[PDB]
Amino acid sequence: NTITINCVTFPHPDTMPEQQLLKPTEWSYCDYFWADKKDPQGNGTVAGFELLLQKQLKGKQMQKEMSEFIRERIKIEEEYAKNLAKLSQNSLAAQEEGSLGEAWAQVKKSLADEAEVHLKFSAKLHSEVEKPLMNFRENFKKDMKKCDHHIADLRKQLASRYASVEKARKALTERQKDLEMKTQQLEIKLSNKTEEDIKKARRKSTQAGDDLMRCVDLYNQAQSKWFEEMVTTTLELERLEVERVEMIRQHLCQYTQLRHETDMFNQSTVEPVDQLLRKVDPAKDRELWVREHKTGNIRPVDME
Template sequence: MDIVRASYPYACSTSGPGGGSKGQLVFPEGAVLLVAERSDDGWCRGYSAGNQGWFPASYVSPITPEQLLVHSVNPVALNSILRSPSWTVYATVEGKLYYVNNNSKETSWTLPSPPGNSLDTLSVPTEKSPLHVSNGVAMRRKTMKEAEKPKKAKYRIVNGITFCIEGGEPQELMNPQAPSYIDYFWSDKGDRSGFDVIREKHVQGKDVIKEMMDFFKERAAIEEQYARNLNKLSKSTHGEQEEGTLLAAWKSLKAELRQRSEAHSKFASKITETIEKPLFEFKESQKTDRKHHEQLLEKSRKQLQSLDAAIDKAKQSLNGLVKTSGKMKRQSSINGDVKIGDDMKKLEATYNQAQRLWVDNMIAACRDFERHEEERSAYLKDRFLAYIDLCVEAQETTAQALTYSTNMVDNINKKADREFFIKKKGTGTLRPVDRVILET
C-alpha cells in the first residue's frame, strides 16, 4: 500500500480500466491518495476522501517517509481518506501503513475491505507490540521487525542480454550428463562474450594444426635431405681397395646406405602425402562453419543491443511524459500513456524474439564448435599414430638392409682374405737360398 500525492487534478476519462466516471477516482491537485493496486497499462486503483476508483499513475507522485512527516500526513489525514467506521490507519516512521480495528483492536498490514467483506490479517503489530504514537504519527522501536522490503529485481541486463539475478532460481543444465559448451559460455567475461571465448579456442585449434603442418613439413625435409646424403655416401670410393671378405663387407655397407636412403626418401614422401596435406584440408573444412556462426552471432548480438537501447529510450520518453503531462490536455496525456505503453509492449516482444533467436544461434554454435573440437582431437590423434606407423615401417625396411650388412660383416675371415690375396697376388713359393761362390 503506497501513499501518493496528486501532482495534477483529475476528472475522468472515457478510456482506462474504469471505462467512465463511475469507475474512476476524481481528485484535486495536492490530494493525498492511498494506492491499493497498480496495473501494467499505467493505471492505479486507490482511495481518496472515502471514495475509490481508477486513475492514471502519471497524475500522482509518491510521498517518501520524510515527506510524510513534512506534509503532516498523520492518522487523521489518512483516516479522512479511508473514512472507515471500523478501522483506523496509522503510518510507521518509514511510511509503512497498518490498520487497527476500533472494536477488536485487531491489526493488519493490508487495506481493510469495504463493510461486509472480511479482512485478511497478519501477525503484525498488536496492541502489545512495541509501537507507540508520537505527535499523531505511529512510531516503532528498534525491537520491531523490519517492514516488508521492496521486491528485488528478477533479472539483470548485461550488455543488452537479460539474465536471472545471481542466487535466483537455479536453471537446469541443458546437458547434465557431461560438461558441454552449451551450459558454460552464456555470460560475458569482461569485454569478451562467451562465444568469443569458444571462437578463440577454435582459432587456437586451427593455429595448432598449422604448427603441426609446419612440424611435419620440416620433418619430411630433414628426411629427404638425410636420404640424399646417404645416397651420396653410398656412391663414394671408400673401401674399394679392399679385397676378399672385407671388400664384400664394404659393398654391403654401401648397399645398406642405398636402401636406407630409399627408405627415408619414401618416408619423407609419405609424411607429406598422408599427414601434411590432409591436415591442411581438415583445417580448411572447419573454417567455413566458424565464419558462418561468427556472422550470425555478431548480427543477432548487435540487434539485441540496439533493441535494449531502444527500450531504455522508450522508458525515458515515458518518464518525460509523466513529468510534462500536467501541461498537456488530460485526454492527450492519457492517449500518450497508452501509445507509449503499446510501443513498450511491441519493443518487449521484438526484444524477446531477438533474444530467443540469439539463444538458438548460440546453441547451434556451441554444438558445432564442440563437435569440431572433438573431431580435431580425434583427427590429430589419428595423424600422430599414422606418423608412428611410418616410422616403424621405415625402420623395418632399414633393419632388413642392416641385417644383410651385419651378416656380411660377421663373414669377415682373415684366413680366407689372406688366402685370396696370396692366390691373386702371390709371386711364387721358392724362397731364396745361400749362394756358393767357390766350391770346395
C-alpha cells in the first residue's frame, strides 16, 4: 500500500498512478531531495536537506577562495607598481641633454605613470571585486544552522508521532485479541458477570481503534508540516544559490572591465613620449650645445 522509510511515508512499490513534479522541468531543490542519502561507505544516513545545506556552504567557501585569488593578484600588481616606480626614479642617462634628453626624461616619467595606473588598478580590484566577493552575506554562519535544526526538529516530531502510532497499533491488536477471546468465553458459558466484561472488551477495543485513527491523523499532520517547511526552505535555498551565481558573474565581469580599461589607460601613457620623440632635432641640439660650450668664434691666421 504505502511504505515508511525513516518515519516518512512514500508510495509503494509502486508502478502507482500519479505523479507530476512540483516544478517541471526546472531541476528544483523541492523535487529531488525527499529520500535520505545512505552513504555507501557506511558513515550513517542524512536527510537530503543536509545535501542542500552542504552545497550552499561549499558555495560560500568557493566565493571566499575566489576573493583570496583576487587578493594575490592585487599583491602582484603592487609589487609590479613598486618596481616600475623605483625604476622611474632611476638616474641612468640623466645627463643626456637637449630634446633627446627631454624625451628620455619623459620615458622615465611615463614609467612612473604606468606604476600609478597599476596601483590604482589594484585598489579598484580591492574595493569592487575582492571585498564584495568576500563580504557577501557574512551572516549565513549560525543562521543556516538555525534553519537546519528547524527542519531536523520537525523530523523529530515526525518520529515521535510515528512511535505513538505504532504504540497505538500494539494496543489495538492486543484489545482485539482480548475481545475475540472473551466472546468465545461467552460462547461457552454466560452467566451474566462474564457478559458485561464481554461488552466492556468491545468498549475498550473500539476506543483503541479510535485512538489509532487519532494517532495516525496527528502523524499525517506532522508530516504535512514538515512537508510545507521542506518546500519553502528548499525553494529559498534555490533562490539563494541562483543569486550567488549572479553576483559572482557580475563581479567577474567587473574584473574584466577593469582589466580592459586599465590596459587602455596604460597604453595612453606613452603618447607624451611620442610627442617629444617627434620634436627631437639633432641640429638644434648640437647648436644649443655649441652655444653653451664654445671656446670662441675667432679663426686662426698666419703669424706676422
